[PDB]
Amino acid sequence: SWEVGCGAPVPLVTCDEQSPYRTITGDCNNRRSPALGAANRALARWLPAEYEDGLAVPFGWTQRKTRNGFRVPLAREVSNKIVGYLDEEGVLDQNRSLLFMQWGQIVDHDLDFAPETELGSSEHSKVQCEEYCVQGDECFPIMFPKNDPKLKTQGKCMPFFRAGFVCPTPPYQSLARDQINAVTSFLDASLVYGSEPSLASRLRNLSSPLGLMAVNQEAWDHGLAYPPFNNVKPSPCEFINTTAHVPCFQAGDSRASEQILLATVHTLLLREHNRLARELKRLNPHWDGEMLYQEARKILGAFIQIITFRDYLPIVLGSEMQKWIPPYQGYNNSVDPRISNVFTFAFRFGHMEVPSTVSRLDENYQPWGPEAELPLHTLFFNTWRIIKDGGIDPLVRGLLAKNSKLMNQNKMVTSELRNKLFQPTHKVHGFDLAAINLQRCRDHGMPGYNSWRGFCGLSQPKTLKGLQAVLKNKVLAKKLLDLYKTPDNIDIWIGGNAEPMVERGRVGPLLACLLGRQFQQIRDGDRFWWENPGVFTEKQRDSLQKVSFSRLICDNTHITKVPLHAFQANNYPHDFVDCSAVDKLDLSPWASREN
Ligand code: HEM
Ligand SMILES: *[C@@H]1O[C@H](CO)[C@@H](O[C@@H]2O[C@H](CO)[C@@H](O[C@@H]3O[C@H](CO)[C@@H](O)[C@H](O)[C@@H]3O)[C@H](O)[C@H]2NC(C)=O)[C@H](O)[C@H]1NC(C)=O
Ligand SMILES: *[C@@H]1O[C@H](CO)[C@@H](O[C@@H]2O[C@H](CO)[C@@H](O[C@H]3O[C@H](CO)[C@@H](O)[C@H](O)[C@@H]3O)[C@H](O)[C@H]2NC(C)=O)[C@H](O)[C@H]1NC(C)=O
Ligand SMILES: *[C@@H]1O[C@H](CO)[C@@H](O[C@@H]2O[C@H](CO)[C@@H](O[C@H]3O[C@H](CO)[C@@H](O)[C@H](O)[C@@H]3O)[C@H](O)[C@H]2NC(C)=O)[C@H](O)[C@H]1NC(C)=O
Ligand SMILES: *[C@@H]1O[C@H](CO)[C@@H](O[C@@H]2O[C@H](CO)[C@@H](O)[C@H](O)[C@H]2NC(C)=O)[C@H](O)[C@H]1NC(C)=O
Ligand SMILES: [Ca+2]
């Protein structure tokens, strides 16, 4: 191979070798090999990178060059022809709450993040992309095909920059380009506590010995907290409503303010940390703040794991769950916990569950106001609707009462995500998330749909007749191939999401596999998975078995009517009950006595 020890990590980090707490950066989880699963490292590769120069140039970069004898189809075209649909009627999920879509993006944000490239503190190359669509170094533009309404309106392309890579950041030239995972790989509530030591500190209230997370000093939501503002200008959140002046929130994960519902659950989490930290200083008055913070951060992680694996995953993989995530058997130090590259494209299945509108219900779960239901696009980096229009209570009820959008072969990604996405750097509400995933698949060097089919031991459709067989849909299989010319070339994201859904789950054969084994590895290769003997005392686990997101809401809001099973479609009021019916997380077990 090229080099066993490359990498520009958060230098200098030695293992406390017996401390009952995870490191903020993920180091020292695995004793034998320390950086396994730590942040700011190359995503893991399950199959060899497929680049045009076999080395780092994306398929679709030069245009005399082909992929298996054919030209790859323009990202935006695959979008226009396959992804979009017009009639939003009937795409809702009869059995999944918006929360279902919402949790997915939290976990995800906890497990991976491949940043973009800058190396420009005061650039014009940033501009050559934006204004000229000049494909060159770190700029890999998304051109618009013939007859795209976006030409008459936006220009010739949608600016797009390549993800960040390893050994350096500047040009570079050796072993197949690998992308960076800026966040730790373990399900450990990092979107909340940060991945860099530097940032993890700034988020804490080190002004008092209480292990509390720093909160907003400028605004309150009925006496309850909000995250603090990211007082860095220029801010996206500000730009969307000049008059309002309300900046983005600041959490352990930078994508925290991308959309209104996501900030909401970020708040509920920040809120739960401090509540835990307080319940613990009432119980263990002698604890210093560091033990508070840590102890709390430990419960929280346990929280995100139990919810994710007990309640979320089973309705995602369905009949395919046990085939991939068999019951726990203990820590396996020989398992690579690292998040793979393809995983970051397989978990995107979620983009197809985002409905076109966000609602705010009042206390009777009735429409809240004259502008209760809003277009999803007016909510990207919209923080001012939280702070200045109800707080998070109205939105938390939308999550529990409203449904998620169901993945459909003829209605894939809502046009609010595929025609009007707002990207923090740019100004217009005209990006296409469908095209973006597709250029990114290519940016990361993903091998085609068939290699993955194979990788997972599934039939490798080579023909129209075969593809048809796999998708149970003659028309999609035909549009697919008229564009790709061969099933070997279909991009993992679109090919993956096009399959029908396995039984009782929400994703098909190939994604069940991909998602299936990643989660199996991060659970089996985490020295701190809550069930692994040693991490939590027997008694402590017995209360942790009782957490529920519904409780998370009850203890951290003023919603008082909640469903018992928040991930499935519940109606109001038949399915809602009083918070008192919801079991609480008893922390007595954390009580520590001196003598
Ligand atoms: C309205 C809701 C959502 C919006 C507006 C949104 C937006 C975005 C955007 C703009 C990107 C950057 C893509 C790129 O540059 O390559 C992204 C990436 C991603 N999204 Fe979505 N997303 C949403 C929901 C979800 C959901 C529900 C899931 C999963 C269940 C999900 C999973 C992912 C993953 C895994 C990435 C790449 C993360 C990384 O490796 O950096 N997203 N999203
Ligand atoms: C930018 O953000 C500001 C929020 O700071 C938005 O201003 C708000 O606009 C509405 C009018 O459409 C004001 O509400 C009105 O008064 C009461 C509600 O308080 C209601 O009974 C009326 O029917 C009407 O809704 C609201 O008070 C006002 N906020 C202030 C003080 O400026 C503005 O609409 C946003 N504009 C953009 C650029 O999207
Ligand atoms: C809407 O989604 C609900 C969430 O999955 C689902 O509830 C599920 O109900 C079935 C009832 O059979 C449970 O499945 C298990 O049922 C028994 C256990 O008593 C077993 O013998 C079966 O083999 C099976 O494993 C699920 O546990 C339960 N889901 C959860 C996690 O609460 C509803 O059935 C769905 N409603 C519709 C409209 O189909
Ligand atoms: C860091 O932690 C500090 C202590 O936990 C916290 O100080 C306390 O902040 C709360 C809310 O800002 C204040 O509580 C209430 O004070 C009066 C009560 O008479 C109310 O009228 C106010 O509206 C407010 O809600 C406390 O006064 C304050 N306590 C102390 C010790 O001064 C800081 O706010 C925290 N800072 C950060 C960045 O999180
Ligand atoms: C830990 O998990 C690993 C990987 O899944 C298991 O290793 C297997 O070990 C057998 C020999 O005992 C080898 O033939 C394979 O290379 C491994 N299987 C695979 C597919 O990786 C191991 O069984 C687990 N360790 C323990 C003690 O539970
Ligand atoms: Ca993590």
Side-chain angles (χ1 to χ4, degrees):
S1 97
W2 290 245
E3 216 239 289
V4 267
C6 239
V10 163
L12 330 123
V13 191
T14 53
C15 309
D16 229 273
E17 198 77 295
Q18 302 277 336
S19 163
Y21 301 143
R22 327 172 145 287
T23 51
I24 263 73
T25 73
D27 289 290
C28 308
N29 187 292
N30 179 292
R31 293 175 155 116
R32 203 175 159 276
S33 179
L36 224 26
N40 281 310
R41 299 249 183 186
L43 295 140
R45 284 258 173 198
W46 285 0
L47 288 189
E50 295 195 356
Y51 286 121
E52 192 191 81
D53 60 354
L55 264 182
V57 175
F59 265 106
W61 181 274
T62 300
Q63 39 159 277
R64 23 138 224 208
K65 291 251 164 174
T66 74
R67 185 162 187 171
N68 297 316
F70 318 93
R71 318 168 131 292
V72 280
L74 298 156
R76 172 65 178 183
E77 181 163 40
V78 167
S79 188
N80 290 337
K81 269 146 192 190
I82 298 302
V83 191
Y85 67 87
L86 252 52
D87 192 20
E88 297 278 2
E89 272 308 321
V91 298
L92 298 196
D93 201 318
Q94 287 319 59
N95 207 14
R96 294 286 185 282
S97 64
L98 225 205
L99 172 59
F100 178 58
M101 172 285 287
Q102 202 43 56
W103 194 245
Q105 167 173 57
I106 273 75
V107 170
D108 192 273
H109 282 196
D110 180 316
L111 307 163
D112 59 280
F113 177 33
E116 280 196 322
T117 35
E118 55 205 1
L119 228 53
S121 237
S122 159
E123 224 61 65
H124 233 186
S125 160
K126 178 163 55 187
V127 148
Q128 185 131 67
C129 206
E130 255 276 34
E131 336 251 59
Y132 303 92
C133 300
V134 161
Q135 181 169 307
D137 253 59
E138 290 321 301
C139 168
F140 177 31
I142 293 168
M143 306 307 290
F144 294 132
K146 176 199 206 99
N147 306 142
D148 195 320
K150 279 176 191 296
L151 301 147
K152 298 179 192 213
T153 290
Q154 288 183 234
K156 270 184 173 193
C157 79
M158 302 181 174
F160 175 111
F161 293 80
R162 312 199 60 172
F165 40 121
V166 276
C167 315
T169 183
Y172 205 48
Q173 269 174 58
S174 232
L175 48 350
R177 196 126 121 179
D178 281 332
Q179 279 71 29
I180 307 300
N181 185 20
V183 316
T184 72
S185 304
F186 314 93
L187 230 214
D188 54 16
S190 44
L191 66 199
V192 174
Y193 305 96
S195 284
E196 294 153 317
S198 32
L199 172 64
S201 177
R202 191 203 318 172
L203 306 172
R204 314 176 48 162
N205 193 336
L206 307 180
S207 273
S208 65
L210 315 176
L212 299 189
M213 286 294 283
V215 297
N216 208 306
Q217 282 315 318
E218 265 59 279
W220 294 81
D221 178 11
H222 306 285
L224 301 168
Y226 278 145
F229 288 134
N230 164 345
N231 282 314
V232 161
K233 284 180 155 94
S235 137
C237 299
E238 283 190 0
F239 173 86
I240 67 101
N241 188 319
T242 311
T243 305
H245 292 287
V246 188
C248 296
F249 283 140
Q250 176 183 346
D253 172 72
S254 63
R255 312 98 125 198
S257 298
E258 187 275 327
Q259 58 114 354
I260 214 297
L261 274 3
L262 169 55
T264 301
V265 176
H266 251 300
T267 302
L268 258 31
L269 293 192
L270 183 72
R271 288 196 179 166
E272 180 49 357
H273 169 83
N274 292 337
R275 187 187 75 65
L276 256 20
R278 288 191 189 97
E279 273 315 301
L280 296 169
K281 169 67 149 190
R282 262 190 181 80
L283 282 178
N284 313 298
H286 50 302
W287 284 0
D288 68 295
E290 191 56 33
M291 210 176 184
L292 277 357
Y293 169 74
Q294 298 285 351
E295 270 310 318
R297 175 176 160 242
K298 192 157 177 180
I299 320 296
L300 204 60
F303 179 72
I304 311 302
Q305 309 215 314
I306 314 165
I307 295 304
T308 293
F309 280 65
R310 184 192 78 199
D311 308 318
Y312 175 72
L313 288 179
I315 55 179
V316 171
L317 309 172
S319 70
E320 297 284 313
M321 169 72 130
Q322 86 202 81
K323 169 174 150 61
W324 303 95
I325 289 68
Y328 194 40
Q329 302 271 158
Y331 177 54
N332 188 312
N333 77 284
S334 300
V335 167
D336 189 326
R338 282 187 301 154
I339 296 286
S340 60
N341 210 320
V342 76
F343 182 74
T344 71
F345 290 97
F347 209 2
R348 299 196 186 195
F349 73 91
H351 290 166
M352 308 198 185
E353 318 182 329
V354 178
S356 70
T357 65
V358 182
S359 273
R360 297 102 111 251
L361 305 176
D362 61 6
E363 327 208 33
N364 278 156
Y365 277 87
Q366 288 301 306
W368 187 77
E371 321 181 317
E373 169 169 65
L374 313 180
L376 187 264
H377 79 261
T378 66
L379 301 155
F380 301 137
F381 296 103
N382 182 323
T383 31
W384 76 262
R385 279 290 186 164
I386 302 79
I387 284 155
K388 289 166 155 286
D389 199 31
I392 66 89
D393 267 10
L395 293 153
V396 174
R397 299 196 194 78
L399 279 196
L400 310 167
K402 295 300 181 186
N403 299 331
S404 296
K405 151 174 195 310
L406 173 77
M407 206 300 301
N408 191 299
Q409 280 167 347
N410 333 290
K411 295 179 185 206
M412 291 198 199
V413 170
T414 170
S415 306
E416 296 280 309
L417 275 179
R418 192 196 83 81
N419 261 325
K420 332 186 147 175
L421 170 65
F422 180 88
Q423 295 248 254
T425 308
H426 314 298
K427 294 125 202 151
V428 295
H429 277 57
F431 277 89
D432 172 329
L433 172 65
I436 290 271
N437 292 153
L438 287 176
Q439 192 85 296
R440 192 71 77 199
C441 272
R442 293 170 205 193
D443 178 27
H444 287 234
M446 290 295 95
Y449 173 70
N450 271 340
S451 305
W452 294 121
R453 284 284 301 187
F455 175 85
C456 289
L458 310 194
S459 57
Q460 283 160 69
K462 300 286 155 184
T463 68
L464 198 211
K465 195 84 218 175
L467 189 60
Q468 284 186 182
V470 189
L471 271 37
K472 283 179 187 46
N473 185 299
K474 286 136 178 291
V475 184
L476 160 60
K478 192 175 294 145
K479 298 181 183 163
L480 235 13
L481 289 177
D482 294 10
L483 266 174
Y484 280 104
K485 302 307 207 302
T486 178
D488 290 319
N489 283 20
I490 293 175
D491 294 291
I492 191 53
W493 185 71
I494 178 75
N497 287 110
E499 288 168 5
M501 299 176 181
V502 302
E503 200 172 307
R504 308 241 68 168
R506 284 302 185 256
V507 296
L510 182 49
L511 286 187
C513 167
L514 286 177
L515 300 177
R517 36 213 305 179
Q518 181 76 76
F519 277 110
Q520 173 260 137
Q521 311 181 19
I522 53 83
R523 169 257 254 167
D524 280 0
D526 169 28
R527 180 157 73 84
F528 295 71
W529 179 262
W530 76 291
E531 277 176 298
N532 175 49
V535 188
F536 287 109
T537 66
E538 158 149 35
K539 283 228 116 111
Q540 286 171 316
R541 284 190 304 247
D542 289 317
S543 314
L544 285 168
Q545 262 150 188
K546 250 93 87 81
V547 294
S548 43
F549 191 79
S550 310
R551 189 80 222 162
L552 187 91
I553 290 169
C554 288
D555 310 323
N556 285 313
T557 67
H558 282 121
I559 303 122
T560 55
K561 293 280 147 183
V562 299
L564 242 34
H565 303 301
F567 284 115
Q568 75 200 35
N570 305 99
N571 279 322
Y572 181 85
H574 185 317
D575 298 316
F576 290 62
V577 286
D578 196 277
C579 275
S580 41
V582 166
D583 322 17
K584 311 177 70 166
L585 162 78
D586 175 352
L587 298 166
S588 61
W590 276 260
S592 175
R593 267 319 171 89
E594 284 337 290
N595 293 259

